């Protein structure tokens, strides 16, 4: 999954 | 509030705030317009479930793929469910119909705690009414350059991928908060940016913001 830093 | 935000952005950008003989960006600062809420963490699992996120008060939420939202307050028990048509219900973790979504929210919760930094962790949020309801995520999208997050209180947040800069646009105060590459932050009134100007970087991000608000309105 893509995600914030 | 998107239409208001579009008007405010049109106004600041038409003033060409970086095309000035002497930009005095600092004179446009107004720390009292710092937001109460912004998105501190997010997880895009839209392949399967949706977008999980944390707000700066440490509450969490999920915008599911079926366009419903479940929010968990920082008290750890209180829930608000928002249907696709906007209908709100107030519940507690402590109905069977929401067990699956509650479980998904907890897993997003855990992932954000396990892996991610809190954006704006060093910023003191504005104090408002301790008893007010939380805003929730209305919609979001990803572009080449940023993720765009639109909250139900009208705020629009744009987090830029390349340099980790972030814009939080607050149309009720016609203000913008900018978090720079060094994690320093400033809040500006858009009208004061018209008066005093701003650097090319911020000007570029404000043009980009107007493009994003148009995309939100088109969606
Ligand atoms: Cl400009
Ligand atoms: Cl400031």
Task: Give the distance (Å) from ligand 2 centre to CA of residue B31.
Answer: 4
Please give the biggest Cα pair distance in chain B.
Answer: 64
The CA distance from B35 to the nearest CA of chain A, in Å, is: 20
Q: Provide the experimental method for this PDB entry.
A: X-ray
Report the C-alpha gap between B95 and B107 in whole angstroms.
19
Same domain, B116 and B44: yes
Question: Residue B215: which domain range?
Answer: 1-39+135-219
Domain boundary pick from B134, B156, B190: B134
Decide which of B101, B134, B167 is a domain's last residue.
B134
CA of A4 to the centre of ligand 2 (A): 24
Half-sphere exposure of B204 (CA within 13 A, CB side): 7
> How many angstroms separate the Cα of B68 from the Cα of each of A1, B84, B86, B116, B155?
20, 5, 8, 24, 19
Longest Cα pair distance anywhere in chain A, in angstroms? 13
Q: Are residues B53 and B34 in the same domain?
A: no
Domain co-membership, B44 together with B130: yes
Say if residue B159 is in the same domain as residue B215. yes
**Residue B21, burial from CB neighbour count under 10 angstroms (0-12, 13-18, 19+):** exposed
Q: Which ligand gives the minimal distance to the CA of B28?
A: 2
- Asked whether residue B130 falls in the same domain as residue B147, the answer is no
CATH of the domain at B31: 3.30.1120.30
The C-alpha atoms of residue B219 and residue B213 are separated, in whole angstroms, by: 10
Q: Please give the tally of structural domains in chain B.
A: 2
Same domain, B35 and B45: no
Closest-CA residue of chain A to B51: A3
The CA-atom distances, in angstroms, between B70 and each of B56, B66, B147 are: 17, 12, 20
- The answer to whether residues B142 and B126 belong to one domain is no
B51-57, Cβ contacts within 8 angstroms, sequence gap of 24 or more: B51/B137, B51/B140, B52/B104, B52/B105, B52/B108, B52/B109, B52/B111, B52/B112, B53/B108, B53/B112, B53/B137, B53/B149, B54/B109, B54/B112, B54/B118, B55/B134, B55/B135, B56/B118, B56/B119, B56/B120, B56/B123, B56/B125, B57/B125, B57/B134
- Domain match, B161 and B207 both: yes
Among all bound ligands, the one having the nearest atom to the CA of B202 is: 1
Q: What's the CA angle centered on B209, arms B112 and B63, to 5 degrees? A: 35
Q: Which residue of B has its CA nearest to A4?
A: B42
User: Could you tell me the distance, in angstroms and rounded to a whole number, from the CA of residue B205 to the centre of ligand 2?
Assistant: 17
Final residue of a structural domain among B119, B134, B149:
B134
Q: Are residues B141 and B113 in the same domain?
A: no
């Amino acid at each position: 999954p893509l995600h914030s830093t | 509030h998107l239409s208001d935000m579009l008007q405010q952005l049109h106004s600041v950008n038409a003033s060409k705030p970086s095309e000035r003989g002497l930009v005095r960006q600092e004179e446009a600062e107004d720390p009292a317009c710092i937001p109460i809420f912004w998105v501190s963490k997010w997880v895009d699992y839209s392949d399967k479930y949706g977008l999980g996120y944390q707000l700066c008060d440490n509450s969490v939420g999920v915008l599911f793929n079926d366009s419903t939202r479940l929010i968990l307050y920082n008290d750890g028990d209180s829930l608000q469910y928002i249907e696709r048509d906007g209908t709100e219900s107030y519940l507690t973790v402590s109905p069977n119909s929401l067990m699956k979504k509650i479980t998904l929210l907890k897993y997003f919760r855990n992932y954000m705690s396990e892996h991610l930094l809190k954006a704006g962790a060093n910023i003191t949020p504005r104090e408002g009414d301790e008893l007010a309801r939380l805003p929730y995520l209305r919609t979001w999208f990803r572009t080449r350059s940023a993720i765009i997050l639109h909250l139900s209180n009208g705020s629009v947040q744009i987090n830029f991928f390349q340099d980790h800069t972030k814009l939080i646009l607050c149309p009720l105060m016609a203000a913008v908060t900018y978090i720079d590459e060094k994690r320093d932050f400033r809040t500006y009134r858009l009208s004061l940016l018209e008066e005093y100007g701003c650097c090319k970087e911020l000007a570029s991000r404000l043009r980009y913001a107007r493009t994003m608000v148009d995309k939100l309105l088109s969606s």
